[PDB]
Design a binder for this molecule. Structure first.
Ligand SMILES: [Ca+2]
Ligand SMILES: [Ca+2]
Ligand SMILES: [Ca+2]
Ligand SMILES: [Ca+2]
Lengths: 242, 237, 241, 236
């Protein structure tokens, strides 16, 4: 089979990517930071689709050595064709008060892990000589700021820039690199008038685009940030309800 | 369900019609050029067990020419998907371009999509079941050509209309996006492009199909660029 | 003296660009599509700064022939160094109901005028061989939509595209082409909580940037859309007034 | 006088910002991470304009403690009205071979410094209650990649995001936050549409404009000064 690895997987977007790719016949790897039972839970659901599931701890508290877990996971699965760098929870902190270690921790978890995992995956894809795909889950805040989450905004921008740089630098290896940039996604209702579509997105509505990016139809798409946001990016003071 | 491709061609238009026919959409086609290509596409659509209906929609006769889309919607019974396909690129140096040439490029490249989108959106509102409008633009929605100022300006216009329709039609659950191709190989190495080849028509049509899927229900107001890395390239590349 | 021409001038941004450029030593041309008396008042104020002012009518209801008034104005000023294509009033019309003639009229007034004026100015700049500047007044709606003004949004996008295309195509002539994209401008503090800076902009706050774009300091700037908007573009659904 | 401080100053854009703001009558603070002699040359030229010049080392190899040099510089000048976070040199490393230490060094020098300096300046501006300006010198690579400088590209994007976040978060204090994004600056070229490198004064001139009252409605933007670099696609 092709092999897809979802890094920093969670019960939301990351789990939904794992399951939809398992249903497409990919063997799946999962990395986890602290939530081993959630990773084991997803792995059991993946195995129910008749593909392989392998998990490993990738400790974002112990970079860069901690990232060598992905090498071991690739060795166990035999190859890698797809890396999906899933986004962790949003950490907020007021700009004026934010401790330097909190600024650094948000970059460590939200960019540095994706950097190290992307480099390991890309080195394996070059070794195989069969191309590959790297898909970074970012946010609308790759593009437009939060008013109370400056580190989170800056790190999403950083992962956007890394996405473009990897796309250009790795294109020669036929490694396609893109971001999927979610808006406000419900992780299980009243209308949400602040969003043009007037609801939160579903995890499936992000994972579906990841699946398309893993299809042969996506073979001309690289260097892009594909925004799935219910119109969040269209909102401005002439729309925003008072 | 019904998908209509306006200003269809033997490239992206045909491949959208065929992939949507295979998802079980009845197909409408309008043509401004290559009627025989539209008829060939309709014959191949019918081989997939769905309906194919075609009309001329003459972009040299706007606005009255656009009423052909009302006739096509009447014949197919409804519309769920509109794909506004893009015509050929016309180049013309800026300093000496005739005003009529400038206006003709806006007529063909945005006025047609405007009128088709209004007719489709009215029908989708009447149905009450939402809909999808997909505008085929260009990388030149975003970045210029050095010798095609009218084409560039009209692609940008269609990108702005995409955003405006997306926001204005959103409470009717009509999702509006652009697919922005780079250099595509059509019936009608490239070291300059990072992937070092032209795109295939199926690599545009594939994304149009995804935008017609339930998985795309949260996607609106966007311009999805399918360009082999064209947008990444600069004088440092 | 260098010459700056402000096309489709008004008592707002266009007037303030004329007055601030007169104060930087530019002879001024003004074209008017509306408000003839305002154009004459601007001219009288410009001449107080010790430079020339010339005005013509340029009727956007008579394109293309009406644009030839700009050739007469350039002749009368002897040269052109700067063209400022000023933006007219925004027209709102619902998308589903909009008449096709309404759609086309917005493109005529908001893109086609700037196209023909830019061609005439660029031809003269090329013949002079001394470079030039074309500055298009667009809008934040070059970039983000209105909810009820699809034609205005599309036409501002079009003028943004034309800005980039002219910048690339005219670069060998050292003709620098940019857009200044205003937000909500008064034509005050804490009166507008929907905007992050909590007020409308002043005409001076647009014209000041136009003045900078006409300075030698701006000689490396081309192809850009410089947004002056009190943070309008930042006001996503998570902005709290 | 109003006070402008140039952080991570150099003999190019940083010096020219200091000189052109001194001409407008700003007292000047200079921090240096490299080229101490250049910071002293800048100060010498600044005082010719009849304003104060104060210099400190701000060591980006010693963060976060090193950033407290900016608190000392503000104390010496009495206030701050303008912070210009100047950009250091571009560092390249191939993506597949890049060490984690190289990635981290580039984020330390190209983002973390600007973050800590911006926080210190913004706190002072809030304490004063008189508004202020923060101007980040980024790059065209805030927007478009290098093909062989992925860390530099990511870090410039990061600083672009921080610029937007600070613009929105600090707006109630009337602290205006923008980036100036240079192309290729000299400190004929047929790869660049205008066929030359930019001059340091063609960047500093825009920074001076952003420090004027006419710029009082500009916040959250990245103003690209690049000779058309961004327009040059595979069709140029
Ligand atoms: Ca379970
Ligand atoms: Ca016929
Ligand atoms: Ca000149
Ligand atoms: Ca102040």
């Amino acid at each position: 089979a092709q092999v897809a690895i979802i890094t920093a997987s969670d019960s939301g977007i990351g789990k939904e990517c794992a399951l939809l790719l398992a249903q497409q016949g990919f063997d799946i790897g999962i990395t986890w930071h602290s939530d081993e039972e959630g990773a084991k839970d997803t792995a059991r659901e993946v195995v129910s689709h008749g593909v392989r599931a392998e998990i490993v701890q990738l400790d974002l508290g112990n970079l860069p050595e901690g990232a060598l877990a992905l090498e071991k996971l690739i060795q166990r699965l035999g190859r890698i064709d797809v890396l999906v760098n899933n986004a962790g929870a949003m950490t907020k902190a007021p700009f004026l008060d934010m401790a330097f270690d909190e600024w650094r921790k948000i970059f460590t978890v939200d960019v540095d892990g994706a950097f190290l995992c992307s480099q390991i995956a890309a080195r394996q894809m070059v070794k195989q000589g069969q191309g590959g795909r790297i898909i970074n889950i970012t946010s609308v805040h790759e593009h437009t700021p939060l008013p109370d989450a400056s580190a989170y905004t800056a790190a999403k921008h950083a992962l956007g820039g890394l996405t473009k740089a990897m796309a250009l630098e790795l294109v020669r290896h036929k490694i396609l690199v893109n971001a999927v940039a979610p808006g406000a996604i419900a992780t299980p209702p009243d209308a949400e008038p602040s969003i043009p579509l007037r609801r939160f997105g579903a995890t499936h509505e992000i994972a579906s685009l990841v699946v398309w990016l893993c299809s042969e139809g996506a073979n001309y798409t690289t260097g892009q940030s594909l925004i799935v946001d219910g119109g969040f990016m269209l909102a401005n003071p002439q729309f925003n309800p008072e």
